[PDB]
Amino acid sequence: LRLSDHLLANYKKGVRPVRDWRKPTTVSIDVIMYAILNVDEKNQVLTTYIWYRQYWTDEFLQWKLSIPTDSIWVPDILINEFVDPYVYVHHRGEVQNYKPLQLVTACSLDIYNFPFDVQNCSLTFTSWLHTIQDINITLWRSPEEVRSDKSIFEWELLEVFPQFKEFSIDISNSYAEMKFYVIIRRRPLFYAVSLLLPSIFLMVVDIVGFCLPPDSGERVSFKITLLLGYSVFLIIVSDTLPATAIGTPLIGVYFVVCMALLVISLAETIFIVRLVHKQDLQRPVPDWLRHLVLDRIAWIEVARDWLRVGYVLDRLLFRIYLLAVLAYSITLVTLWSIWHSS
Amino acid sequence: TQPALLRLSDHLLANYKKGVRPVRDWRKPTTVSIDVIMYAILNVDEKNQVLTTYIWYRQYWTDEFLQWTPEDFDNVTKLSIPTDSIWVPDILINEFVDVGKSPNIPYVYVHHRGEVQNYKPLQLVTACSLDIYNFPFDVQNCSLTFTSWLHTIQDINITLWRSPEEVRSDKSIFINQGEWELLEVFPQFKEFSIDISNSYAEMKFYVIIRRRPLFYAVSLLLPSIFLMVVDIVGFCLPPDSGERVSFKITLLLGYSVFLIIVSDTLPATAIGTPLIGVYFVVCMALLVISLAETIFIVRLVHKQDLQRPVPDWLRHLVLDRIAWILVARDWLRVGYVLDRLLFRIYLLAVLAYSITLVTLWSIWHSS
Amino acid sequence: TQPALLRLSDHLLANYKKGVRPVRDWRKPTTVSIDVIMYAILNVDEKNQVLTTYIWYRQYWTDEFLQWTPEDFDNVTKLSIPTDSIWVPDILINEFVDVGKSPNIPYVYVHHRGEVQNYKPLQLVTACSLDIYNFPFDVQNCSLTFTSWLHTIQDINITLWRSPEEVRSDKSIFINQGEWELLEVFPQFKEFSIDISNSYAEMKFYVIIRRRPLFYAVSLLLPSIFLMVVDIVGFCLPPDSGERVSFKITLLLGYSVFLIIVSDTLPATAIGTPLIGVYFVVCMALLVISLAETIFIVRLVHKQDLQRPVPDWLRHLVLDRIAWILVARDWLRVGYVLDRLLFRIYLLAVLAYSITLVTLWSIWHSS
Amino acid sequence: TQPALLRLSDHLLANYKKGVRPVRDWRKPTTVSIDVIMYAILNVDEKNQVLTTYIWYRQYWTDEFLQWTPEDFDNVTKLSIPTDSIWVPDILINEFVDVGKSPNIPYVYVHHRGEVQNYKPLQLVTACSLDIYNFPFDVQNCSLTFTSWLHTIQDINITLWRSPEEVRSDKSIFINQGEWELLEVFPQFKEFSIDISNSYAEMKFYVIIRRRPLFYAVSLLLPSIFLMVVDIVGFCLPPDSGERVSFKITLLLGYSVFLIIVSDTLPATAIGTPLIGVYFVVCMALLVISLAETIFIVRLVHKQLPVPDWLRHLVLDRIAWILEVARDWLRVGYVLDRLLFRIYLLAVLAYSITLVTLWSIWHSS
Ligand SMILES: NCCc1c[nH]c2ccc(O)cc12
Ligand SMILES: NCCc1c[nH]c2ccc(O)cc12
User: What is the enclosing helix (H) or strand (E) of D300?
Assistant: First the structure.
């Protein structure tokens, strides 16, 4: 009890421990990651669980002692991109600080590879107000060699490595910047089942629908039901994939491409249904665009007028849709290869 | 005591009282200089109220009790002492709904002439006016006001550390990510007085903000126009006694899904739904009317039913409305002419929808 | 000489002991006038029955130790004593389930006669009843009980700064743009006694609020009405025709999705579900029953599976039904009477839904 | 002259020092009565294994240094002393995780015989083992232990202000319209000792909370059973080789939306998913299998190949006993579709049975 009274008398919080104020103090911090947490995909902020572990170098306190955090000085080393009591002090001249934190740090998020995304984010360390001409953050050891190889970890933590430069930080002329880039990976299984699994069947059922007779009215009902299916799947699209200034990911483009393609197919099918003997109306073609289109096809009552053109247009659209499906498959293969590479 | 930093700090904080305002004459109000630099507007979340933002905040007021003269002390020109030892003005936001989670930092700089610098980040959450009538092409005008919560004008006064024209166009450190882009910050100085004649000092920072609708356009708009163009052929291309019974209900369910999608991302507000939602409701009503028409004039009601006398004065109307616009046979003719009328109404509705989307885009771009 | 403020603050705070109730006679209670201004209703959580609201709170008590003659201290009649340096009473809301992220105001005005004014913004997370039987046309009242945690009437007595009418009809700074509209704030003071000699002062503010249902009406009421209307009008199709089968199938798919998201959207409390959830699940059951009727119809005529069996239950039940409403052929007649019965049931259900909506709106608008 | 309250407070705290046990004698201990009243169960995070409550915790210890004759201080028989100027028992919670944000009450009465009372609201966050295997019909049993911390009895003897019967039915102030229903608060007294030399004193405020399933009845159970019935009637209605693939994929999309809602509603634990997530996943798997088989059969029949004959013998012998070369393919597709329908009916029967069994266990409490 009386030990604290003696030590607290000859100590001031506001002053830096220095023999002379010209000499700059040295502060060391080692960042410990654990249990990576949810990342808000909106490209605004990500939340992670961290351990601080700050080590000091020189203090004018000499005589294990436990003291409240308000009885010893703690430097205001914080994070530049940052949003949202017992002290382990030794009599030899070293102090230890134990406190868990959540960064909830703002960063730049990449969605263009959803859901197989391996994005990079930074953890910059500095002091918000200190000029840091005397409290530089030169570290005790280099975390590059030791931290990178192994760590103690819906998201996967992959690699955290440091990087330093002298002059930086925009709040003031701050000498403290030891950036901690963070690499994370996402579990895609739930996202795969929720998005890719129902969508890929929406690519193969439409192929099956092309086997139906184009002139038959049953294909119209099939396309109507698939249009309702895309209407329903739009809810999944809106709920699952996030919003970003870059827009929808590379997967989201193919969804609207296939929806537009099926809309065009349905419109063509309905037009052919009208123009075949169901309604016909002896409607003639100008015979100019007809022969032009026939010449284009040449390289890779009222029956032949409409049935042939409808069939060839349906075959062309089926080829286009199969090409779109192949592009989708290639995109997923490439995304999975690049994500599993990391 | 050889470094004498302890001596300097204890000399400045010897007879200093934190609670007393630092003025030699009590009749002179203390003037606070405010600098606000935007960082992000992350997590706008619900659009009924609330606006989350991150700013970098500064304060510059002169303390007359910390005017220690140099050339006799350690010859320093800059001292840092904890914020818990000096008087700090009670500057607060009127819309200060949530304090948020921000690191409260000590050690405000104190100059050798007494000037105090109070750099501090603020993770603000404020309540402002959010008009979603033009969604997704939305531009919002939210206020970040700063005022003394309890001190009056003759106690605390508010000024700007830099001229307003510098504040408007100094979005330097702002990160240009997320769905929202900051356009303008407008500082204005309007006094505050609610009940009695104790004049307050209030400064308004009008944060003009803009939304990027690219994702929203791709996700919600382009499918909507696809359903419009499906309806346009659907009214005229499929004839009666066909698949129209399933067609109209399927597109009606699609429009209902569109209303659902608009609803989930847009919270309840004094305005019911944006203009796009109003047009979706109108198209749903038109589809209901078309379905009622088809069922009532085709199939079991009229096509299968026989010897049902249908008179009325509508045949007198079609002798004139068909000129203005341009029992089985009678039923087919009346169904066809009313279907053409519904075609014209829906074509007008789609034209109005496209025109209003163009108008909203023009307003959003010309902001 | 010393500044006027420093001398006055030293004179007031010398030999001043907080934690002692500032009265020169301990037998007279300290009257703490209370005034509350409602600023915003941040959130009304029916899940946890907690009301999140933001109010501007003012206190008013007389400290008999902080009295000074204005003739001295250079004619000063007001000060800024820190809050944590004097006696501040123990009034707090009994309904707290969370303190809230309310900023602290470290200053008060002490007048030259001892009158102390406390201004602070309170972010309240308080428990309520939150009956959702009338959703969306929902009117709810919440109490804000201000009483001292452990001070009786003989120690602390709570009154109103303003007259009850002024508190009731304030509507000054409230944000009239959210989901909830503030109807009134009803203050009334009742002495609360746990026993015969431990009466406690208590002030109750009744925050009566009213939801804005236009958004919910457009999002939920219009689609959920159009869908049942088209379901009614689709019974005009022949019961035995296969065109109704696809109609029923796709209507089932769309309406099932619609109800999935609706049931996700609707709130739920301990009492159960709103009055419209009953009609929604009733329509669920009715649509399932209609599809089962189609199942029975299709198997009769699509194949020869049901042609061989004959009705063993006879027409007695069917005869009673046709009296109440007013081999194949027999099965088709059974299908027709069941279809007519389901038509009556749908008509009754939709009529009841419309009457319920009208009654809910009339209750909501009247009060 | 001097105010009675001011003079009395000056006299009481002049010789008083915080940190020393108020009992003048060095032998007999300091009894500390306790009275805990539950107000609300704010949050139960099963993933983090933290129980967030809100109690009204009261202490009644008879201080000995705060004794005064009323006749000497203008008949003041009761005084309000700041809680930071006198000794207060250091009773903490053994299951402590976080203290939360609770209002600060800085006053405590002392009577003319030194009878201090300390009422305080606590937004406690405690760690208790939570099992969600019976969601939403789950009954939890979370402890609440108040310990002596520094003192090792014969200094502080924690006792109850009221008998366990009074504290058991503390529903006079509870907000009983939330998700969790407070069943009982049963206190248990037991002494634990680090060493045989001396023992500690503690209480065990067993708090049993039962979840109200009516919150999720319309959100999960009714939509789930509606989708089960819809899947059944969608197996029944369309022909197996007919125009069903479009309807089946629309149904699959709807049920995937339902699973999105479920994942946004159900809670997650390190133990695993509740008993209904298994049924949801099983129904998804069977629906996907049915859609894939129907797609395969329709593709083969529209291909126009007759039978592999490595399975026809077993299908006729075994698979057929569930109860034009493409015609045999259509028949075997129909047989497998009927088998899948029977499997789905068995699965929905199991789902219906387990819900009543879970409800009965929940109702048994
Ligand atoms: N910035 C608000 C200052 C203010 C002026 N009048 C008030 C009345 C109550 C209150 O809490 C605050 C105020
Ligand atoms: N002085 C008010 C004490 C108090 C607070 N909450 C209470 C609830 C019930 C009661 O009898 C008393 C109280």
Answer: helix D275-303
Residue keyed to tokens 């201990």: D29
DSSP A1-25: -HHHHHHHHT--SSS---SSTTSPP
Radius of gyration for chain B, computed over Cα atoms and rounded to the nearest angstrom: 33
Amino acid at C259: L
Residue type, B273: T
End-to-end CA distance of chain B: 62
HSE (side-chain half, CA atoms, 13 Å) at C29: 17
In this structure, the number of other CB atoms found within 10 A of the CB of residue C343 comes to 16
- Give the DSSP per-residue string, B213-248: -HHHIIIIIHHHHHHHHHHHHHHHSS-SSSSHHHHH
CA-wise closest residue to D348 among D197, D232, D216: D232
Q: How far apart are CA D143 and CA D296, in angstroms?
A: 56
Which amino acid, B51?
Answer: L
Select from B338, B336, B337, B318 the least CA-distant residue to B240: B336
- Report the relative pairing of strands D96-98 and D156-160 from DSSP bridges: unpaired
> Phi/psi zone of residue C130: left (φ > 0), alpha (ψ -120 to 50 degrees), beta?
left
Q: Please state, in angstroms and rounded to a whole number, the distance separating the CA atoms of residues D249 and D233.
A: 15
Q: In angstroms, rounded to a whole number, what is the distance separating the alpha carbons of residues D12 and D82?
A: 12
Best CA proximity match to D201, nearest among D30, D14, D26, D74: D30
DSSP lists the bridge partners of residue A65 as A89
Identify which of A110, A101, A93, A275 has the alpha carbon closest to the alpha carbon of residue A184. A110
Identify how many contiguous H helices and E strands chain C contains and give both numbers. Answer: 8, 12
Documented resolution in Å:
3.6
Strands A118-121 and A178-186: antiparallel
Q: Work out how many CB contacts closer than 8 A connect A with D.
A: 59
Pocket test for ligand 1, best of B92, B149, B199, B204 (most atoms within 8 A of CB): B149
Q: Rounded to an integer, what distance in angstroms lies between the CA atom of residue C129 and that of residue C146?
A: 18
The reply to whether C294 touches chain D by the CB within 8 Å rule is yes
Helix (H, G, I), strand (E, B) or coil at C293: helix
Maximum separation of any 2 CA atoms in chain A, in Å = 113
Report which protein residue has its CA nearest ligand 2's atom 11: C194
Å between B337 CA and nearest CA of chain C: 21
How was this structure determined? It was done by cryo-EM
Q: How far apart are CA A243 and CA A248, in angstroms?
A: 7
Q: Give D164's contacts (C-beta < 8 A, 6+ positions apart).
A: D186, D187
- Please choose, from the candidates D130, C313, C215, the residue with its C-alpha nearest in 3D space to the C-alpha of residue B46: C215
Work out whether strand D156-160 and strand D30-45 pair parallel, antiparallel, or are unpaired.
parallel
Q: How far apart are CA C354 and CA C222, in angstroms?
A: 11
C-beta of B152 in contact with ligand 1 (< 6 A): no
Query: In chain B, what are the domain boundaries?
Result: 1-212, 213-367
- Report the distance separating Cα C241 and Cα B108, nearest Å: 84
D51: CB partners within 8 A, 6+ apart: D41, D43, D44, D124, D125, D126, D127, D128, D130, D142, D207
D317 exposure class (CB count in 10 Å sphere: 0-12, 13-18, 19+): exposed
The one-letter code for the residue type at C245 is V
| C124 CB-contact burial (10 Å; exposed 0-12 / middle 13-18 / buried 19+) | buried
From CA A154, how far away is CA A288, in angstroms rounded?
60
- The angle at the Cα of B170, spanning B165 to B174, to the nearest 5 degrees, equals 150
Which of C32, C152, C200 has most ligand 2 atoms within 8 Å of CB, for mutation? C200
**How large is the angle between the packed helices C328-366 and C275-301, nearest 10 degrees?**
170
Task: Indicate yes or no: CB of C103 within 8 angstroms of CB of B92.
Answer: yes
